[PDB]
């Protein structure tokens, strides 16, 4: 009937993007200063990693129940849940400030993991609900950006806030000030989400949302009887999991090939995540202008395969600035792909909920990342870095062709 | 399992890894050396013996904590 956009769309996208930033900061805070937390708690680097690995393990199971609550309860309920869990995870980490309270920090990080299942695949649902045509792909990218910027900030804030002193009493004071900051921002973002996050604007922002409005396992059966979405799940998994396996093993590579350059390995990782924030935005700003979702997806994908090859065959040319350029180009393209993939999924399966589509894409990427990381660490230890790198190139080359058999079946476009 | 390693020690020098993972050759090891697993039975083979092959060869199990050498 009437399709009107409101200005609260920005407010909602910014509040979501900000507590997604906060959640992504909580995921990486322990790692940024891992050696400091190993000493504070007296645990292994394995135990401190479990903190970062728990975010990824929780998502695969809790996706299906969380996406049901999405349609059974709504998007305000999902926002309040996610924000509240992000706040609870953060505050439980203030009964962990004693060397012997590692179980409680893990209790906190699990809660913070469960909060992500209510945040990671939600960008495309919020875009669909609040943003109209020619801006839906950009909200989704403003959220992916909120997440990437929290991973970045998180690399940079803990080494500044907490020094590498060994004193068990002053390090606790230096971790209190980080835990307090994050708790007090997760509380602020929570209280706003309860204030300003409407379940739906007054009018549908788009003609596709207006018509969407007019069994859970049946709908999961129907997304997997759709070949263009199966191909996209597989190829998104290949690309994003290769990105994960690339990032996990990036430090190890630069120390093997540039021994003594630990400062610059972390700098190269910041370059990957910063270049990625920019590509996330521009990919979305390019899609809401052109609407070229099968051709963008293929060219990017093919640019993630050219980039993995150049990285592969330039890691031992003895030039650290070349590694900066190559790793920055990958992160650029491999993070610009993620918002593009979500929106191409929403185009291939339009009436179907954006939650289920984006969550299935995320579960794939998290499965393929775990598999590729396990496989690569076994290939590198036994055959070298170039072989483990080629491994990633051959799954990217295989994914390129799979991306090309996905049809440009743009339903949300056809519904305008 | 396949947690068997074959080392070569020449007198007054450290053991050198020839084969690991039962059959996997370590990088740099002459290709004459090759190892096979057959249940709890493990066999090292030098396809062509060489002036170098004269030494002591030790089998090792790394399956359990108390690493045990042959």
């Amino acid at each position, epitope marked *: 009937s009437v399709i009107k956009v409101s200005k609260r769309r920005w407010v909602v996208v910014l509040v979501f993007s900000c507590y997604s930033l906060c959640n992504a900061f909580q995921w990486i805070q322990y790692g940024s200063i891992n050696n400091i937390f190993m000493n504070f708690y007296g*645990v*292994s*680097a*394995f*135990a401190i*990693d*479990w903190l*970062s*690995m728990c975010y990824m393990l929780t998502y695969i199971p809790l996706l299906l129940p969380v996406a049901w609550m999405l349609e059974k309860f709504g998007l305000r309920t999902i926002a309040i849940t996610g924000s509240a869990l992000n706040c609870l995870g953060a505050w439980v980490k203030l009964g962990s400030l004693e060397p012997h309270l590692f179980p409680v920090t893990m209790v906190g990080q699990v809660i913070c993991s469960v909060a992500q299942v209510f945040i990671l695949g939600m960008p495309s649902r919020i875009a669909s609900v609040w943003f109209g045509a020619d801006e839906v792909s950009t909200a989704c990218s403003v959220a992916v950006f909120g997440n990437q910027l929290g991973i970045a900030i998180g690399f940079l804030v803990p080494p500044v806030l907490v020094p590498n002193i060994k004193d068990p009493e002053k390090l606790a004071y230096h971790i209190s000030i980080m835990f307090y900051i994050i708790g007090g921002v997760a509380t602020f973002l929570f209280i706003l989400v309860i204030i300003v996050f409407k379940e739906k604007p007054k009018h549908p922002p788009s003609r596709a949302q207006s018509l969407s409005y007019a069994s859970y396992l049946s709908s999961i059966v129907r997304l997997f009887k759709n070949l263009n979405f199966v191909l996209l799940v597989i190829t998104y998994g290949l690309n994003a999991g290769a990105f994960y396996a690339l990032s*996990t*093993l990036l430090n*190890r590579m630069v*120390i*093997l*090939h540039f*021994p003594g350059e630990e400062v610059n390995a972390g700098r190269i990782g910041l370059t990957i995540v910063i270049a990625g924030m920019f590509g996330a935005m521009i990919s979305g700003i390019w899609l809401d202008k052109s609407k070229t979702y099968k051709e963008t997806t293929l060219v990017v994908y093919i640019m993630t395969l050219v980039g993995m090859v150049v990285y592969t065959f330039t890691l*031992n040319l*003895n030039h650290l600035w070349v590694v900066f350029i190559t790793a920055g180009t990958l992160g650029f393209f491999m993070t610009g792909y993620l918002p593009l993939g979500f929106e191409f999924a929403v185009e291939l399966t339009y009436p179907e909920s954006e939650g289920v589509s984006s969550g299935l894409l995320n579960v794939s990427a998290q499965v393929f990342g*775990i598999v590729f*990381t*396990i496989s690569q*660490g*076994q290939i*590198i*230890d*036994n055959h070298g870095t170039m072989f483990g790198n080629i491994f990633l190139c051959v799954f990217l080359a295989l994914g390129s062709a799979l991306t090309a058999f996905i049809k440009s079946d743009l339903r949300r476009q056809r519904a305008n | *399992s*396949s*947690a*068997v*390693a074959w*080392y070569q*020690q020449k007198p007054g*020098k*450290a*053991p*050198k*890894l020839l084969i*690991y*993972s*039962a059959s*996997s050759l*370590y990088s740099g090891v002459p290709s004459r050396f090759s190892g096979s697993r057959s249940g709890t039975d493990f066999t090292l083979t030098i396809s062509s013996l060489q002036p170098e092959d004269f030494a*002591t060869y*030790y089998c*090792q199990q*790394s*399956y359990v*904590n*108390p*690493i*045990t*050498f042959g």
Partner: nanobody
Amino acid sequence: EISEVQLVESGGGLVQPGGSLRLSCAASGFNLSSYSIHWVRQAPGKGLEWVASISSYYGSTSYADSVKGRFTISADTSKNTAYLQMNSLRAEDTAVYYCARSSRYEFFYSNSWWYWPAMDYWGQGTLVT
């Protein structure tokens, strides 16, 4: 470039029975933080014998039964040096103590699922009498 990996054992010397000595193993080319270090001993009239292993990553220390309660394995990742404290040495602890490295790089996804690691690089040895 890929610096070559070297393990250098120091400390070994004659010591009186009930003597305590501390061997060291400097590590170049890799970090004791990503790899587990093992101690193996050979007596002039014996063969290779596994003493102790430490994982910095997994925070695990394992000891041979004979050495247990007299030998402590430890690692200083800040120096890339591992050590062995032999508190109550017996005349049958006279041997060439060699420090070796496992092939497996330790990280969260590290596993023995296709390839079981082995002792890749070894030191020259330091003799304790």
